[PDB]
Design a protein around this ligand. Structure first.
Ligand SMILES: Nc1ncnc2c1ncn2[C@@H]1O[C@H](COP(=O)(O)OP(=O)(O)O)[C@@H](O)[C@H]1O
Ligand SMILES: Nc1ncnc2c1ncn2[C@@H]1O[C@H](COP(=O)(O)O)[C@@H](O)[C@H]1O
Ligand SMILES: [N+]
Lengths: 399, 398
């Protein structure tokens, strides 16, 4: 069986065709600037051959057609016809209270996603677009949905409950959810393996740092606590997200600037984070370079980001009464060695120590902590696509 | 030195005269029913002698001129003339920026106190009715203003700034200020003495647990991080406060419930906390009972509260790169061996352990941790008036 995993964003679309027979990633591509000028799609074959097509991509639909065209490229493709795509896995951030486990797509599931648009303004609408593009290009192909909140469902009440009037939890299902679950679960299993101990016996602090970032306290292979909550805004500072700020600032900023609830939401989700502090951009790579060239703002922005990650690391050490290892994955966590250093410096007092040199290695699963450090520090590249393709393989077969 | 600590109120006036030589409270009083009927002033002298005088107290200025009569009483007083009162210290919760240290009241220091009203969403603006009194009743005498937010002015930028648009900090002052400064500092000083080392060489985690709660990371005697922020709302769940929740919830609630800005703020500061969860009381002592009596919501509210505090202990363990001791103060922190247990259990992984027997003791400086524990856990009662007295003294010296 072959599965196309889809990851949609407002104007981007990450895809990946995986051969479930030997779980090999036949091809990995990306569509950018969907809706802007100079639309483009890049693809990389398992043999290295790369493709790039400059062609206007107005909607996620057009891009999904170019995707099928790239996948079936006579020489740079990996298949002959669209029919070779047996199923399609989709990433969906919020499924709501009702949907928290991978599920075959149906009118009902589509209802829950849209209904949750307000719970994940930056992701669900775009994920939904990908799902639609999909239905407009390959209607006959089975579709499975995998939710970011799934993995965090084993949290205890004293953790997912907010200290608000109890009726809010009943009247509106307002509780902590968490996201990036599918990623936190994958790298967590990887850590258990690099530890040599069985999952049930390990205590790990997984760190997903990308456009969005979140930490999770995995005990015995199960999420017991996570940085994000009701929505993907709570927690760490991110690309354009403010994270856990004093809530009183909302009403305050609303009165002082006379902003509407809609506006204060867009401000917290699209104009804050490192973008808001740096005043430069949301790309941590850009910020890294700009900070190293003398831009105080970019410097301050990354300073706030690493420090916040550091505090959460200490915060989950108490939760787990001692963590065996800390895991860095995702865009920033896998590639950035500099930001990683910023996050881990000054933590030898809680067992964390790292080899500055081994820490300079590229994208490789490796222990970057001193061999004597009580706490291991793995840099594990994430692979949600496989996690999603695996989930998609099961649902479609098990009826 | 002899300091007079005052605490103005709606129609009351609490005060204390402390001899800084032995930091002993010579006398302590309270003027009740001010600006109304049945005006009364009650003073207690150290050697068990209480005075109750029914003089009428129109304006606070008279309530202070009476505190003079009482402090100088032939038999119930403690001083001959008003001249023995070297300085006067009053506490003001909101100190905001500017005031990185206590300020010796004058014309300037009063402006910033009045200026900071609409520039901050605090509920109880400075009751200057107390300070005003001193302005006249006691002219040639240093009057110090101790701010509950100053102690945190040592926080670095990457800590007090929020990951919000920079313009907000620059044009509206949005940053983390923190509160309970005097208490955290007082207990942080006591902790260093208990560790038997200079404050400078100590890293301490101070915990102020009361109706309102906050945690402060103390590095070398200076505040470097604290749980509350722009307002007392941020941080832990408290008696009626929700603390740091997902910000998205605010605009969400306002939409679903059709609330106003002022309404949503009231819901988070007064209708939330352990009160909102248990739906019983904002009082922990009563919740502790209900809890052991099988009250679910009650039990749930205590788990959330203790858990949060725990999360902050580890969070600050990373900030201070290892803490030497954790301090518990304030009402819940001084008298609840129940909650302290909920908080400290399951932390041997980060070097924290407690002696159940030593944890039963109420109100008294003591190390309740085990002798093998790497992190000392002290129980230190906080003395607000003496804390403001110490503070007032130092500003009077330099
Ligand atoms: N080498 C790098 N240096 C700095 N930041 C990086 C680097 N690689 C990735 N990042 C960060 O990760 C972001 C995207 O990561 P992520 O959200 O995981 O998406 P994706 O991995 O699909 O690009 C980039 O915009 C940047 O902020
Ligand atoms: N013995 C106790 N056990 C549990 N809670 C207590 C006890 N004594 C006081 N409290 C709580 O601690 C807080 C002290 O308030 P404050 O003095 O303002 O810090 C109040 O909200 C009380 O309910
Ligand atoms: N307050």
């Amino acid at each position: 069986m072959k599965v196309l995993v889809i990851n949609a964003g407002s104007s981007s679309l990450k895809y990946q065709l995986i051969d479930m027979t030997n779980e090999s990633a036949l091809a990995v591509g990306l569509c950018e600037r969907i809706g802007i000028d100079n639309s483009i799609i890049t693809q990389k074959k398992f043999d290295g051959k790369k493709l790039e097509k400059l062609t206007d991509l107005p909607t996620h639909k057009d891009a999904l057609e170019e995707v099928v065209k790239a996948l079936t490229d006579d020489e740079f493709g990996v298949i002959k016809d669209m029919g070779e795509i047996n199923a399609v896995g989709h990433r969906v951030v919020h499924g709501g209270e009702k949907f928290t486990t991978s599920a075959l797509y149906d009118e009902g599931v589509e209802k829950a996603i849209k209904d949750c648009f307000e719970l994940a303004p930056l992701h669900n609408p775009p994920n939904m677009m990908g799902i639609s593009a999909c239905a407009e290009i390959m209607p006959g192909t089975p579709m499975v949905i995998v939710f970011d909140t799934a993995f965090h469902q084993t949290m205890p009440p004293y953790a997912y409950m907010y200290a608000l009037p109890y009726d809010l939890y009943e009247k509106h299902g307002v509780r902590k959810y968490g996201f990036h679950g599918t990623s936190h679960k994958y790298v967590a299993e990887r850590a258990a393996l690099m530890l040599g101990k069985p999952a049930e016996e390990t205590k790990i602090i997984t760190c997903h740092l990308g456009n969005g970032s979140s930490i999770t306290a995995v005990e015995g292979g199960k999420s017991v606590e996570t940085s994000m909550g009701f929505t993907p805004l709570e927690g760490l500072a991110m690309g354009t997200r403010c994270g856990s700020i004093d809530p009183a600032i909302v009403p305050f900023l609303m009165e002082k600037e006379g902003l509407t609830t809609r506006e204060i939401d867009t401000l917290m989700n699209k104009k804050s984070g490192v973008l808001g502090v740096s005043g430069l951009s949301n790309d941590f790579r850009d910020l890294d370079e700009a900070a190293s060239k003398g831009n105080r703002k970019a410097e301050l922005a990354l300073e706030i980001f690493a420090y916040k990650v550091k505090k959460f690391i200490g915060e989950y050490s108490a939760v787990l009464n001692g963590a065996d290892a800390v895991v860095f994955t995702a865009g920033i966590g896998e590639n950035s060695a500099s930001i990683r250093k910023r996050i881990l410096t000054g933590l030898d007092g809680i067992g964390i120590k790292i080899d500055d040199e081994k820490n300079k290695i590229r994208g490789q699963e490796i222990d970057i902590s001193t061999p004597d450090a009580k706490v291991r520090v793995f840099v594990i590249p994430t692979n949600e696509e496989l996690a999603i393709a695996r989930e998609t393989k099961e649902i479609v077969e098990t009826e």
